[PDB]
Design a binder for this molecule. Structure first.
Ligand SMILES: O=P(O)(O)O[C@H]1O[C@H](CO)[C@@H](O)[C@H](O)[C@H]1O
Ligand SMILES: OC[C@H]1O[C@H](O)[C@H](O)[C@@H](O)[C@@H]1O
Ligand code: NA
Lengths: 479, 479, 479
């Protein structure tokens, strides 16, 4: 069991300069407002913001040491990424492949494109790949031979072969090591691409995907860890995850709420909460930006397009899904590049009301560090480094964070976080209440404990009433 | 009969400094990659990038001499402009009109607005306008009298009167001189504007336009030349040209391919290839902007707005087709001001694929020099001269071209150009192949010679298989 | 080479009672108004209105004898159907397959489904079939063995195998026999389905389709006959046919005029006329319903829907394409079940104006007999026999035809037919004229001969002025 408490999502090096400064910031400000951390990839990596790890057993010295990670465990749950799809081209295992060729003992760890034979144009177009080139890298071996390996993402990320056995060893090896350092929750990064079969989309291929997923879940449970598979596709996949004793992501909530607050409409939101999957980890913002496929169905297309058209002016160029010439269409946008606070027009009341609704949604709530600090789109950071997503990946010095913590909106968010992390009613059962089509009433009951949220989307007001058991009376949370 | 080879579209003075530097670059890089040249207007001109010639019988000394032109004819086809619509106001023929008035023997060579009497506003609205004012210039005669002449374009370009006889004389004289210098292909510039009749659109007025067009074709054949009539409107006009033993423009192809690659959609392209006008000169980019009206019907309107909206960010202010009686009105989009490479987001694979599809399209392919060198939008040049289309009219020094020739994408383009100009299969018959809705299959067969293009618009991939006749085996072209 | 004259489309037994009554009716009224006939299938048939022939070498005694056929030849062109795709299951060739099994010498004449092995679900969904059943018929052999054959249409129609040799003879045998009886023009029924290749649409498969189509055309040319391949799909195929010395169908014209007249719009019509494929056979109504896919592109989707909604009230249930649950969507309708006269709301002026535009469209005009007699939707005939297309397949007795010939509107149409068949200008060249966007101006010139149509689509007015060579002056055709 994880702590039913708010979690902080954060990089190692963007609050302060390293894992030690991160720990300093948490203890100074968040020591009793969060119950866990999701520390974004802190491994030796050579691509894509830490998501091309050479191994899961080392910490990039630029960030700290394993002792600096274990400083968080013992008081906080620890969520860490497991890049189950791919490992770096600089990894010991893949470098051994280039030197020795197919004589390498790590050969069957990777996907060899010539194994599949000729792939028809139809089977190629099926493949759910998000840039405009084939997912195939031609690498040159030490002996001069040219061969191709499966490569979904950037070329420094070589995909693993779940049709062989070696890949399961490596994950089981990684999991054993991470759990020994105190990892409670394994975020299964990009698991949907693990399933390759020519003739299918090679993404979330059923029922193979769940067998791979049940296996990893068993390994984590053996080593005292639960799983958080991250998938950006139709929400029906989140329920499949939910029904296999794993934590799905509440990705539908961010755009569902953004539309809901901007348009003063509680209908689709109440419909969702009433049927939202269980054991999910709810988010508003992530390190990636607001994802659209995750709300298809949850929100009608015309209302999704209203959302897209409303945010376009406050957001940088969106991340696109491939070959979508119609760049202002629901079917074209993959992720909206925007801080969540800019998505609500820097409206304090709207942002707090959103976080309250998140906190009363069933599941473990994660708060992204930029959102924690009510960060705005980082134009300056985005314009250097070229990374489109850095618009939501502010760097903070410890002073700049101390200063952001004094903003009135952050003090308000900080009270919600303390209330959600400590008040016992959230350990009970969720009971949605009746409301009109422009306001939402959410409540939690655990024995004598009870708390009740009411948000009027017409005026962005947030009211929480809770029962103080030490006195029996009903008080107003001041936030 | 023209050479079935790639042609270069180029100015005299924008590779190096003159026609002499131009000839140097052709022999160094393209000597066996092109079979002809379209050298943009190199006559004495006083407006609009050479298109206001005082005569077609002289070479602007800033560019070179007629001897510099004939250096190209001995080895290459020569396509040169015939401004059938207009000649300069500094021309001898028009200056004689200013001095002597209507007593000049060249008076009936020009269109006098006063023939019509009053022109009602309704008759004005029929005529489209390429300037910001009515196409009527008030000129002052030597004796002080004020009279008006028809002037479609800039006021230094005076339109000719094809209701009289003098205009046919001048064209026949112009044609004779150019063919005597080795000109094979006469580009009839803006011939659609030659037909004037109040009560009509004064543009492509039927059937007068075809009689004017059959006449010039007659003169050219006598002097050993074929014609390339330039008309930017519905593709139906391109077929009428094809059916009169003239070369139409494959003007439909550029915006069609831009869409086909951007959206990974081969349906509309495949339909067009199946019915494309025959004996046409195919282009992707020209010395002008990418023209939209030329793809109506070929491409549904909703997809055209998609295409236009996708290019808006990568293109300058568009050229508009305004009507009269309404001179300060946004009007309809005519040409997108953009390099073809910036129109494909500078995606190398997509650009090579575009040229591959062009080169397998039936007809003589022209490659515009900027496209040859994978040039980007020239913001600095456009802002320096104020000419909106100079964003696609880059200047290259001999060094700047030599360096651009070593770019990998230009090396790939140069391999295709050598293949298309030399491989004999293109002299046979075109045979389109079946494919899915995201790929194109084009093939050419001439006896034992056979070559096969496959372009997957999902991944922007280009594959050509050709048969080496001296051995009978099938090889892959490396590009 | 055919007579450039109006042709009659007619059944054998639906004017009068047999072919002799047809000959009687033709000579009495049309003897100098048409130059040829399209006699719909008059062979022994057991399915689909005559299109399931047991042989092309016999005439169904219910219709007459071959002598009744040769009575038309010598004075009229003769167009007869060649069902190149399929022959009846009661045919001599196929019964031998049932009797002997694969030991039959006619075994390789038919397509055996088990030859292809497993067909993936994707390869089945590709198949362009407009029914909701697999195009596979399970037949029981005489020896009890069960095997499957390819069957596009009704189960009495077994498809032919153009991967073998027997199919080509059977056509060559049919063609030799039909041309020996005086047939000029072979209507190649449903030729698009002759190409089978698993993984393709099995319809118009390029370039195989032209391999088959160039073959038949020569075999027909050998025996003094030209071909009329019927295909209902995008017009690009019509030019593809046109460019191989065969006659395409002007299938785009019927719905194009219907829109143009109903909405007073000549824009798309003039565009088509300017570029329409020629050496085509033009039709307005046929023995089939008014076909929608043949005008996609020629007419924008929004304007096609205008047509569909206007015809919905005056038409029976339309024939649908496969799994088209959206019964009010351009992409769903295949053919509109309606006579052409009811499609123009029984407006005499509008119907004549349509026929006038047809007769001046480049190509051989066919007049369907129901259109000839200005027939209305036959509710009674449709509700009996259950055949949805019989709403356009009126039965006429010899009296009923004599009576309809006296209708004022039929007298006008009969004047046009004489003019289009006899006036020599139509043997010259087509010249489209300028007109506003709500009227059409069409003219023909052949030497001294000249005729000029002007149709105002606002008011359905028809005027034809011709140069009478018997006096040299310009007269008005009275219709
Ligand atoms: O309609 P277009 O093609 O842009 O105009 C054409 O005639 C004009 C005057 O000759 C020139 O401005 C263009 O360079 C030429 O291509
Ligand atoms: O595979 C790694 C990529 O996708 C993952 O889901 C990460 O969340 C994203 O930040 C990264 O770009
Ligand atoms: Na693409």
């Amino acid at each position: 069991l994880l702590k039913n408490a708010v979690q902080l999502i954060c990089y190692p090096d963007r609050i302060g300069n390293n894992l030690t400064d991160l720990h300093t910031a948490v203890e100074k400000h968040l020591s009793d407002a969060i119950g866990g951390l999701h520390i974004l990839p802190f491994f030796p990596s050579n691509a894509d913001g830490g998501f091309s790890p050479l191994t899961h057993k080392e910490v990039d010295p630029a960030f700290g040491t394993w002792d600096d990670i274990e400083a968080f465990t013992g008081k906080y749950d620890l969520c860490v990424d497991l890049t189950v799809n791919h490992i770096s081209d600089e990894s010991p295992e893949f470098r051994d492949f280039i030197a020795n060729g197919f004589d390498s003992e790590y050969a069957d760890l990777f996907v060899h494109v010539d194994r599949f034979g000729d792939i028809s144009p139809d089977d190629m177009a099926k493949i759910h790949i998000r840039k405009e080139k084939e997912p195939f890298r031609e690498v040159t071996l030490a002996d001069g031979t040219k061969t191709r390996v499966w490569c979904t993402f950037t070329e420094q990320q070589i995909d693993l072969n779940y049709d062989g056995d070696l890949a399961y060893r490596l994950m089981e090896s990684y999991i054993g090591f991470l759990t020994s350092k105190g990892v409670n929750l394994l975020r299964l990064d990009a698991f949907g691409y693990t399933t390759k079969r020519i003739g299918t989309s090679c993404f979330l291929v059923e029922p193979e995907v769940y067998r791979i997923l049940d296996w990893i879940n068993e390994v984590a449970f053996k080593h005292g860890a639960e799983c958080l598979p991250e998938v950006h596709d139709h929400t029906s996949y989140q329920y499949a995850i939910s029904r296999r004793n794993m934590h799905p992501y509440g990705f539908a909530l961010p755009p569902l709420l953004l539309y809901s607050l901007l348009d003063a409409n509680s209908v689709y939101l109440k419909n969702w909460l009433r049927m939202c999957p269980r054991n999910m980890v709810t988010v508003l913002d992530t390190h990636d930006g607001i994802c659209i496929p995750d709300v298809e169905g949850v929100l009608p297309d015309d209302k999704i397009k209203v959302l897209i058209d409303n945010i376009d002016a406050r957001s940088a160029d969106p991340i696109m899904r491939r070959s979508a010439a119609n760049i202002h269409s629901v079917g074209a946008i993959y992720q909206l590049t925007c801080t969540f606070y800019d998505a609500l027009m820097q409206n304090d009341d709207a942002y707090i009301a959103a976080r309250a609704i998140q906190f009363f949604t069933p599941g473990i709530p994660q708060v992204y560090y930029v959102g924690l600090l009510a960060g705005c789109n980082d134009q300056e950071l985005m314009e250097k480094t070229g990374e489109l997503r850095d618009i939501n990946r502010n760097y903070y010095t410890l002073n700049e964070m101390d200063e952001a913590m004094e903003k009135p909106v952050v003090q308000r968010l900080l009270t919600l976080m303390k209330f959600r992390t400590n008040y016992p009613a959230f350990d009970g059962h969720f009971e949605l209440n009746y409301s009109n089509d422009s306001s939402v009433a959410m409540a939690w009951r655990h024995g004598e404990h009870y708390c009740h949220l009411f948000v009027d989307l017409n005026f962005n007001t947030s009211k929480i009433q809770y029962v103080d058991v030490k006195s029996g009376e009903t008080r107003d949370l001041e936030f």
